[PDB]
Every structure is written in structure tokens, then in C-alpha cells.
Design a protein around this ligand. Structure first.
Ligand SMILES: Nc1ncnc2c1ncn2[C@@H]1O[C@H](COP(=O)(O)OP(=O)(O)OP(=O)(O)O)[C@@H](O)[C@H]1O
Ligand SMILES: [Mg+2]
Lengths: 103, 35, 76, 48, 132, 97, 76
């Protein structure tokens, strides 16, 4: 006997679900991209990297009120010196990979 | 006789190839925007 | 050692496994073969379905025992 | 009044220096041509 | 149309809860939800309040997932207190009192779901021995 | 680290490493060896006796009852190898430099 | 056919729907009835938070069942 044509119901239900989903993500990476474009704008202070630093979370990290920045980033953190002679700590670096920054 | 799936599977495979790599493009972009 | 697997499409597969491997791990390996999400997969041994947390050896699956692999729609 | 340092190439961005405030990365306006802005000359810059 | 006489009544329990929660999150802007009833078009009562879990951005917070409140709003009705939600609050430590340019946006949808909604703000470090 | 809107303490941190002293700590490609420095084979020992031994075998001096010298200066006319000696020591002694 | 939804204000809403309707179509109908941005609204049923691409059919929903609607919430 020839049996279990269920594959076709498997098949097409996949085909549509994938095809639309991909397209939707294509849109959002488009949209979010222009969002980034508007943060850059133009005037930028210039400054020097003083440091490159590596810190780890607290022993307990509840949800509730908790800050998703001062802890729970696995990468480096930095310290910078502005031209106006201020020093700032940066718990996250931004649009640049730390692997290519040096004091 | 029934062999229906094969060709469409290949189509789905190309879609898989797209979709998986597209998720990479998504994740990194969001990792920028959230910052 | 390897098991055999027979799909509804008539495809026969010969998968090297450990008998101590969990059925969920075997289904993950099958997904590794062909992307097939484990939730869609159903494994039957000699007419008995295999529990996710089951090993292979729990009914002593060995030596080219042919599991039937069935595909189903799924969604919560 | 500021003093220019250098010019990044093609579509241009410039580096600006003032003698007590900081340095900046800036651009031009519509009324100035990109030809007569050679590096190493004092220029006028808006306040905001 | 709206008027200049509407009056908000709050219980003691909401007060102590809000003060404690706001003071615990002292460097940052914590969040919470408040519930009660509109007894008439001139007066509104808030009876009780419960906190909410967040992941905090440096500037502010967003409610992490709605399954929590979907559970809570029926978990407690097994013990009376069937009231519906009426508003929300957040704390500004030492800044003063106002709605930011995004707090307004959050209030927009609260009002779109129910036009009588309210927002509340508290200052837990400037309030001393009175005049909270 | 202080929050810039209210200045409340947020974290403690380790001490600075001033970037000049970082660039001083590990910048040397030189790789010369004592085979490449002829004819001052005794001054080499005279310096090695100061910097190398009391760093690694300190109880001898304690037994005799003295504390080793802290430092020395190399002097002489131009071109007699004063920097080459220090390059060789730096390349072939395991320490912080 | 027709389906219900309720929300934490005690409000209920009723939608003419079909099982083929996608979740995004449902969200669209909700906005058409009330104007809420589809990204601030979120849907829950069976303890599961919804996603856009699935449908009433594959969600196993049946006549006049009541969904839960809930709102996005942030400070700023
Ligand atoms: N004793 C030596 N053996 C081998 N090469 C030497 C010797 N003395 C000097 N040189 C050569 O001198 C060159 C560099 O000189 P060096 O760097 O030692 O200067 P210096 O003697 O310390 O001078 P200055 O006092 O001006 O710093 C190299 O080519 C090195 O081979
Ligand atoms: Mg020299």
C-alpha cells in the first residue's frame, strides 16, 4: 500500500511559514538599521582610550529591579579621557569591537 | 508513485541557508541597537 | 554501533550511536542530519514509542534495530 | 574661530581644534565650497 | 468633559508599599502597578499595589514579561480582592516630579485602554518626616 | 564609579595603569644574546652578580649578614656597548622589566 | 466564526474571525477595533505568549474562547 501523504501537509505548512518569516526579518533589520543611523548624527567629541578592563558579575543577580549594564555583559569595559579633561568609565563600549583597541 | 517532497525540500534547504544566516544579521544588529 | 531508521518516505538511515544516548539526544542528532526539529520527530521501536528521557538500551536497542520515524504536525 | 587639523577623504568630515574647548569632528554648510578649505587655516564655526 | 474637581484617594497600605519599594531601588527608576476602582466620575480610589520585575537600562526600566502579571491578577482573587487595575507609578529619586518624554508614551496606551487612567510619581529621598 | 545624575556610588575598581607606563612595560623586539657581545666578559659578570642572584637565592646573604646593593651605573666613552649590554640582559633574563 | 478576548481592566472584546486567521491578522483586527499599536499589545492563552505567524487553526482554538490581552510597559 502507498501511505502517509502527511508529508505534504508537513511540507507546505513549512514552506509558507518560513517564506513569510524570513521576509519579515529582512524588513526589521532594515528598519532597525536606519535607527542606528540617526544616533550617529555628526558632532563628536574626540577622546583617548586610557584603559581596557575586564569585570565579572555580582554573586547574586536577581530579576526585579536590576540593571542590565553594570553587570551581565561578558565582554570588556573601558575607561576614556575626553579632550575636556574628564574621565569616564564605560560599562559597555558601543559600536566598536574591543579586540582592536589599545591604550 | 509518490516522491513529492524532494524538490521542495531543496527549496526549503535554500531557505534554511538564507534564514539561518539572516538570523546572524538580526542578532548583531540588535546587539548594536540595544547598546 | 549503529541503529537503523526507516522513514515514512521510505528512506533508510544507518546512524552510529551509543546505546546510552538519550532519545532526545538521538533526535537532536537526527536534526543535525537534516534540520528536522525534534518536536516533529516520533521514534517507534518494534511498535513501541521511545520516551524522550529514555536511552536506547532501556529496551536494549542494539545492532541495526530499525526504528520507525514518523513526522507529525505540532503546535501548542 | 577655530583651527582645522586634517580632512578625512572623499565625502568629508573634518577635525576641529579650539584652544580651551575640545576637538571635534564636523562638516561644512551649503554656502562654502570644498575647494577653499585647505588644512592649516583658521575658520569660523557655529556655536551650537 | 473633564473638570477641576476630580479627587484621588489612597490607602495607607499603598503608601507604605510604595515608599519601601522606591527607597530600595535608590539609584534608579523602579516601576509598579496599582489597582482600585472608579466609584464615580468625580473620585477614584486606589486600594492596593504590587511590584513588578524589570531588566534595567541605565536610564530607566521596562517590564520584562507580561506572564507574571497575567498570573498575579488571578492568583490573588482566590483570596478576595477582585479589584481591577487603575494605574501605575515610578519613582524619581531627588529629581522632583514630572513626566518624561517617554513616560508620556507609556501613559498613552494606558489611557487608550481606559480613558480614566492615572499616573503617580513619588520622591523617596527628599521626603522627610512628613510632606512625602 | 559614580552615577553622573546623582553621584551615588556604583562600583569599586582597581588602580590605573597609566598608558605611558603600559607602553614602557612591554615594548622590545630585540633578541640579542651574550654570544653577540665580545670582549667585556668580566663586566657582564659584575652586573649579573647584582641583578640576577639575590633575586633567586636570597638566604646566602642573610646567612653572611648583609643586604645586597640596589643599583649601579654603566659609564664610559661613546660606542663601547653600554646599551647593547642592557638589551642582552633584557632579552635573556626572566623578570619584569 | 467568532472569538472573545479580555483584559485587566475587565473589558471584553469580540471579534469575527476564521480559523485560517493569522495572529498578525488578529492583532490587526484589534487595532482596527481600538487603535492600539500592534507592538504594545501582547496576547496570552494556555500560558503561552503568542507569535505572529501562526494561525487560529494551528493554535487549536475553538469557538468563543477568550484570549488575554496585556500591554507593554516601560519608563523612560
Ligand atoms: N663590545 C662590543 N661588541 C660588539 N659590538 C659592539 C661592541 N661595542 C659596540 N658594538 C656595536 O656598537 C653598535 C651600537 O652601539 P651601542 O648601542 O652599544 O652604543 P653605546 O656604546 O651604548 O653608545 P652611546 O654611549 O652613544 O649610547 C652595534 O653595531 C654593536 O654591534
Ligand atoms: Mg646608548
Amino acid at each position: 500500500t502507498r501511505l502517509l501523504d502527511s508529508e505534504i501537509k508537513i511540507m507546505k505548512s513549512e514552506v509558507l511559514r518560513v517564506t513569510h518569516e524570513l521576509q519579515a526579518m529582512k524588513d526589521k533589520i532594515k528598519e532597525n538599521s536606519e535607527k542606528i543611523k540617526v544616533n550617529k548624527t555628526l558632532p563628536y567629541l574626540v577622546s583617548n582610550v586610557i584603559e581596557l578592563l575586564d569585570v565579572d558579575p555580582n554573586d547574586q543577580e536577581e530579576d526585579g529591579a536590576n540593571i542590565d549594564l553594570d553587570s551581565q555583559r561578558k565582554g570588556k569595559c573601558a575607561v576614556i579621557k575626553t579632550s575636556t579633561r574628564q574621565t569616564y568609565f564605560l560599562p559597555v563600549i558601543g559600536l566598536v569591537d574591543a579586540e582592536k583597541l589599545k591604550p | 508513485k509518490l516522491l513529492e517532497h524532494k524538490e521542495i525540500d531543496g527549496r526549503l534547504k535554500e531557505l534554511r541557508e538564507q534564514l539561518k544566516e539572516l538570523t546572524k544579521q538580526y542578532e548583531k544588529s540588535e546587539n548594536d541597537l540595544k547598546a | 554501533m549503529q541503529i537503523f531508521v526507516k522513514t515514512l518516505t521510505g528512506k533508510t538511515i544507518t546512524l552510529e550511536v551509543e546505546p546510552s544516548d538519550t532519545i532526545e539526544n538521538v533526535k537532536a542528532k537526527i536534526q543535525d542530519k537534516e534540520g528536522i526539529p525534534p518536536d516533529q520527530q516520533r521514534l517507534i521501536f518494534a511498535g513501541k514509542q521511545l520516551e524522550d528521557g529514555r536511552t536506547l538500551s532501556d529496551y536494549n536497542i542494539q545492532r541495526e534495530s530499525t526504528l520507525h520515524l514518523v513526522l507529525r504536525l505540532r503546535g501548542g | 574661530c577655530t583651527k582645522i587639523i586634517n580632512a578625512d577623504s572623499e565625502d568629508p568630515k573634518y577635525i576641529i581644534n579650539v584652544k580651551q574647548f575640545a576637538k571635534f569632528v564636523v562638516d561644512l554648510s551649503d554656502q562654502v565650497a570644498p575647494t577653499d578649505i585647505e588644512e592649516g587655516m583658521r575658520v569660523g564655526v557655529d556655536r551650537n | 468633559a473633564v473638570d477641576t474637581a476630580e479627587q484621588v484617594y489612597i490607602s495607607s497600605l499603598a503608601l507604605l508599599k510604595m515608599l519601601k519599594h522606591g527607597r530600595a531601588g535608590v539609584p534608579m527608576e523602579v516601576m509598579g502597578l496599582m489597582l482600585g476602582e472608579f466609584v464615580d466620575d468625580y473620585t477614584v480610589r486606589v486600594i492596593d499595589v504590587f511590584a513588578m520585575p524589570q531588566s534595567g537600562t541605565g536610564v530607566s526600566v521596562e517590564a520584562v514579561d507580561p506572564v507574571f502579571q497575567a498570573k498575579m491578577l488571578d492568583m490573588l482573587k482566590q483570596t478576595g480582592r477582585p479589584e481591577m487595575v487603575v494605574g501605575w507609578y515610578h519613582s524619581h529619586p531627588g529629581f522632583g516630579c514630572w513626566l518624561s518624554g517617554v513616560d508620556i508614551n507609556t501613559q498613552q496606551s494606558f489611557e487608550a485602554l481606559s480613558e480614566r487612567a492615572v499616573a503617580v510619581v513619588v520622591d523617596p529621598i527628599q521626603s522627610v518626616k512628613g510632606k512625602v | 564609579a559614580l552615577d553622573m545624575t546623582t553621584l551615588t556610588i556604583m562600583r569599586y575598581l582597581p588602580r590605573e595603569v597609566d598608558p605611558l607606563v603600559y607602553n614602557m612595560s612591554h615594548e622590545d623586539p630585540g633578541n640579542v644574546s651574550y654570544s653577540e657581545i665580545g670582549g667585556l666578559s668580566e663586566q657582564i659578570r659584575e652586573l649579573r652578580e647584582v641583578i640576577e642572584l639575590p633575586l633567586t637565592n636570597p638566604e646566602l646573604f642573610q646567612r653572611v649578614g648583609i643586604i645586597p646593593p640596589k643599583g649601579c651605573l654603566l659609564y664610559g666613552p661613546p660606542g663601547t656597548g653600554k646599551t647593547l649590554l642592557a638589551r642582552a640582559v633584557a632579552s635573556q633574563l626572566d623578570c619584569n622589566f
